[PDB]
Amino acid sequence: SYPLSKFHFSVEWGGTKIGFTEVSGLDLETEIIEYRHGASPEYSKIKMPGMQKFSNITLKRGTFKSDNEYFQWYNTINLNKVERRDLTISLLNEEHEPVVTWKVKNAWPLKVQSTDLKGDGNEVAIESMELAHEGLVIQNE
Amino acid sequence: SYPLSKFHFSVEWGGTKIGFTEVSGLDLETEIIEYRHGASPEYSKIKMPGMQKFSNITLKRGTFKSDNEYFQWYNTINLNKVERRDLTISLLNEEHEPVVTWKVKNAWPLKVQSTDLKGDGNEVAIESMELAHEGLVIQNE
């Protein structure tokens, strides 16, 4: 009778750790094609589905001693070659088991962003990555 | 101390209405005759006036219910006969009186062009006419 919360989750991306600070961009989108012939009694258009799009996925985590994984994956790019991975994102229950799963096909990294530095910057250094992919399936049983 | 504007005007052409959307082609042109005899110290030609020309005049208006005048005038053509008319074009002042007048002799229509139709054509249907004539006099007193 109650909705799910948004703070207990995990990400499987081929790296050593599965803990993240922030995950965003799990969207699906379709184009519209419009039409009207001149003899129609209505003065508006009829609509049908076009081609499909996906958004890029952003992942954020804190920087730790001796963990250089964002860089190492990015550095697998060689002219048109890159290591592609299966990305699995999951929202967890009180037993730490999956409830809602987002399945992502053929991901690789477009960009890796490092932290800024400040003399009075009393906070955690956070690094982030942006991923391209070829498709998303949502499972909730 | 100020020049005249270009949007307040009227056209008298023998039809029921005098309002138009657009008027163009009120031009005058003369040919040149060139000459040089071989003994001249200058290596260029002397110039004098030749024969004269006039341009065709274009008139544009919106289509209205039950007004078929462009067609009716055009349809007076019979082998080499046509109804010829005196065309008077005038630029108006704030009292709606003439300021600048263009006087055109012996006009008749070469062509009548109808509107295109479009399913998404959210605009006014505009018809146009092109006129031949035998002379133009400009009055500005």
- A93: tokens are 């229950």
Q: Which residue intervals of A1-88 are DSSP H helices?
A: 69-74
- Which DSSP symbol is given to B12? E
CA distance B22 to chain A (A): 28
The CA-atom distances, in angstroms, between B37 and each of B32, B33, B44, B45, B46 are: 17, 14, 10, 9, 10
- B117: tokens are 């139709």
CA distance A30 to chain B (A): 23
Per the CB < 8 Å rule, is A36 touching B119? yes
Give the integer Cα–Cα distance in Å for B108 and B83: 7
Does B123 contact chain A (CB < 8 Å)? no
- What method was applied to determine this entry? cryo-EM
CA distance B118 to chain A (A): 7
The CA-atom distances, in angstroms, between B107 and each of B19, B74, B92 are: 18, 12, 22
Reported resolution in A? Answer: 2.4
Residue positions counted in chain B = 141
Note every long-range contact of A75-79, with CB atoms under 8 Å and residues 24 or more positions apart, other chains counting: A77/A108
Give the integer Cα–Cα distance in Å for B131 and B106: 10
Q: What residues in A contact B125, CB-CB < 8 Å?
A: none
Per the CB < 8 Å rule, is B120 touching A37? no
